[PDB]
Design a protein around this nucleic acid. Sequence first.
RNA 1: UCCCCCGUGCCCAUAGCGGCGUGGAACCACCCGUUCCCAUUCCGAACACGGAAGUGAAACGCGCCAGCGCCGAUGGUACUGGGCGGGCGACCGCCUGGGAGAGUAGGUCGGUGCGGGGG
RNA 2: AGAGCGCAAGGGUAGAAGGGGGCCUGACUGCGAGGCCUGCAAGCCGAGCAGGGGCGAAAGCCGGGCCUAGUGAACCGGUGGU
RNA 3: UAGCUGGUUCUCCCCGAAAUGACUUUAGGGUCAGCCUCAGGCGCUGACUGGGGCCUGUAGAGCACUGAUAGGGCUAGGGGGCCCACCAGCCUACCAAACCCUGUCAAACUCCGAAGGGUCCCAGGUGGAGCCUGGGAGUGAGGGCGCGAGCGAUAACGUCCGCGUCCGAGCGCGGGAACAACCGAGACCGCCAGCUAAGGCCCCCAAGUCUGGGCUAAGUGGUAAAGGAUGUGGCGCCGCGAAGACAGCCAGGAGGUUGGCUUAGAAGCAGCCAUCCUUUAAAGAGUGCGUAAUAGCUCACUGGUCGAGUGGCGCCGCGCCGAAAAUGA
Lengths: 60, 84, 141, 99, 185
Amino acid sequence: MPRLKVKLVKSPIGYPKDQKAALKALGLRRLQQERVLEDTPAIRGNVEKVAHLVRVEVVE
Amino acid sequence: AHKKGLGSTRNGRDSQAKRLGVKRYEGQVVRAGNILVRQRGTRFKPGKNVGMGRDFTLFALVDGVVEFQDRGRLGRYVHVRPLA
Amino acid sequence: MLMPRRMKYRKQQRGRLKGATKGGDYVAFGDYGLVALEPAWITAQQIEAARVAMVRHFRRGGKIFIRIFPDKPYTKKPLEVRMGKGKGNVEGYVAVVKPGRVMFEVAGVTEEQAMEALRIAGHKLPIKTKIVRRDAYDEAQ
Amino acid sequence: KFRVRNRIKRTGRLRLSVFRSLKHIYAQIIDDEKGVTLVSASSLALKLKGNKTEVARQVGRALAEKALALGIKQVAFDRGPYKYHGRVKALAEGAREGG
Amino acid sequence: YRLKAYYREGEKPSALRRAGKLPGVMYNRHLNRKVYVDLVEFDKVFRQASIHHVIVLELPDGQSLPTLVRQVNLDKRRRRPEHVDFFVLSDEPVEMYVPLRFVGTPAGVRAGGVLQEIHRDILVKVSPRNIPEFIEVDVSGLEIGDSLHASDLKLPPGVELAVSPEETIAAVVPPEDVEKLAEEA
RNA sequence: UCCCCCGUGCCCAUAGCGGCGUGGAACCACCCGUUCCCAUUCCGAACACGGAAGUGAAACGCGCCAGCGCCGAUGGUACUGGGCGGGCGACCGCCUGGGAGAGUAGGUCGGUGCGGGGG
RNA sequence: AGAGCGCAAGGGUAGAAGGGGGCCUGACUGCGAGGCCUGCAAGCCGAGCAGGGGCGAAAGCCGGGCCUAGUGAACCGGUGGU
RNA sequence: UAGCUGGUUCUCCCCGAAAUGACUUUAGGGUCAGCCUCAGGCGCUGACUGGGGCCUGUAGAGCACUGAUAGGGCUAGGGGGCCCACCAGCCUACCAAACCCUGUCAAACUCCGAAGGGUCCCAGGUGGAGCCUGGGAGUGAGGGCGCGAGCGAUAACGUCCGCGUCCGAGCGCGGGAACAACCGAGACCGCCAGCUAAGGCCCCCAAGUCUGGGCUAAGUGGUAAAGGAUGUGGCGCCGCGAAGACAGCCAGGAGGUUGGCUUAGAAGCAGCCAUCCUUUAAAGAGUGCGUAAUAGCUCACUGGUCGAGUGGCGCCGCGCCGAAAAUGA
């Protein structure tokens, strides 16, 4: 399984609490936060839930 | 202002909603005396170590796990099977 | 006009009316037709107003059909009252009509006849409509 | 027309699925669930006798031994139109203990 | 008559639509590919068709095949076709709607009266070897209140029937005037 | 191993209707006697107890047909998570995924294991 | 299954809960596994256990009624007993 | 006495709420749990999500229950007449049980039934997750926007619930001209350092009078409708036409006739029906004006001249009339 890699692009303040629970499920702190990640449909869906606050790249 | 003849009603009366539904499903261990289906008419007919009471309510007789069944020309079935 | 004389509920809640006609844009009846453009109630008062203006303009005319039917209870509270204490009154007996629904159609008329007629008849209603012929409408029952 | 599942009032435990018809008596003892049967004994369909009531007697008791060969002890006489005139083979002495 | 055809791939209709191609499906007995045409000549030609006339779709695949229409789902909103179905023909007795041309000016007609257009298009079982064009319907002797139905219509030698036959194909109805302002009462 | 039937059960009508053709050699069913066991708010119809002659219509088992009945793809659309504009509202639009019934094609009068008898 | 299933309706039912007869009296006694429900309190469900009882050839059902409404903690006192 | 008003004093550090559910002589107070806090204990549990198993009747939609429902056809009975009795016939631009077809409607209708939520199972997920006992609280007028329903009138900066959030406590920040809640975005402090969000770049005020092509003539932009018009751009449709057309001009523009029917009269021409035939290249049972009705004028239609395009129907974008209230724009 390749490695996933994502940042945080769009502020958490004023959006659903579930999506923010995903943002905790990743570890996404403040704005501009490059994150090293592992691939799995679980975390994949977790991140797909925030497909707008987050920059996507599958660094291998 | 002037507020002439108005009126009243007769409908400020509601029935205290009683929590009804199905509690346990296939995948859950239910051990002897656990209600798992709340209903009024036979929405869920008993069976394999399943039980019914004085108000059409399914529960657990065994320490077994639930599962379901469909038998059209008979009804809807619940069978709580355990282990050999 | 027209409605039930005794249905099921004196009152019923307003509801939400978004769109899609639910069903009814073809024919099987008239040869020209009038079709709505907005999702609103049409009042049976306005309905019969159209029926009038229609058979009115063209006298001795043939037969016109109404696909719609005003069967919606409007809740009209008494005048000069106060908030709460009840509801409205079984007034404004109307029908739920959304865009693309054939309100009403003519058959046996003349070209320009059906034109000017349905033109005015539609000009009456609380909206604006489409004057349509009969060709594509074929099939769908 | 005698369904009611009298067999549901026999779903209690262990069956004896049978039927009577003019010439033959179909006295069968059946393990259920999988519906896997076991013990049959008939009128002249077992090549025994010709009067159902006598056959019954003998048959049940023959059937007794059959049951008593396969570790069988108790079931329940299965029929809705049974009426129960015993046929005092009544598969009671006939293995089961019955009545 | 003649019309173009092209094979649909599986691209979302939204594009095919928004451009100018009219999306649809065709089939026969078991076959069921997906296709598309072009609104303008499709519209123009279909007027001279419906399930009354037979159509031909030539295709850049090496094969040109004719069909009849069937089931046309629409937009509802703004009223216009947005999809079509085309049943491929055969030669084995098929069932669909033959047009009935109204013919006759009797007593219901003339002396007021309006024809009751019930079934121009009627369900019949005709062998696709034969093609009933414009089945005449005798109005020549009918008066208001009465009607016409059943086997009374034209039953061409190469066409069989299977509806009721009871179903009233047409009738004559009374006109209106200021006499319904008396009804207004 | 399998054929025909009887007892039986499972799928839940694509298993049901109807029309039709066929079997009684073991069966099944009518039939048969109403003394005996036995029962009917009345009927030996029903349940019966005792059974020779007959029957295959009716009961049913198998077969052929769709007329009725049941199923219904596949295209497209409705409505909709989630995301984003536009309108005074009434309300309309786009992407991303989710995906009906309506109906057209067409499907279908059966699927099947335990036990028993004859061959 | 549109009948009926006391009463309002919902849900449900002719593989009975409906309607007919026979013996009866489990509107049982001492307990209650474990669950519904939930702010507390009150309400809801019941296996099994043991005493004995009724019907059933039996297998077996019975701790009131097809269910959801028909209800009032406690303080006080009546009454019979321990 | 005071369930009420009011005051309630130094510094910093850490976390951080509720403005509900139940019951109350209860409604602007209260006790119970919920949401916060500290101590100690228990360890990947928790939010979240992937797969799988099952519970679900809202939307839609359909019409099989049920009501309603237009329209036709059929048809019990019934309106009525002709017309008899052992009793029946028969007929209708009548009423209507039911059924068939034509479409149709619904929160308390439901054959189908999503999106979705729910919960168990395995999996990951280290976070002011979570569980468990224990002391301290406060909180129970909340409000806006968002969609989903009620109510109101499909009014209210109206109230009523639900999921969702911002305020409150974020009147600390930047857009929004100014504005708790619209957009953007979580402030330990310093900085005369770099990017960037929302909006924005002609100058306020920081940055393109950049680039390239479309629309409009109204200050539209710079906030209004049904509706209206030879406004302007662009698309499409059906004739007319080099056999000769749009338009202009010349001319013929006719006869039965005063069509019949009405009517004081109705003569193409105030009105019902109609719904022709002929002399001809062409001329109507007429299109307007006019008449007391005739008269006349007149368009239609067809040639003479002509010389190149013309007439109509629908669409899309932007506009214009529609468009008036009060200190000064």
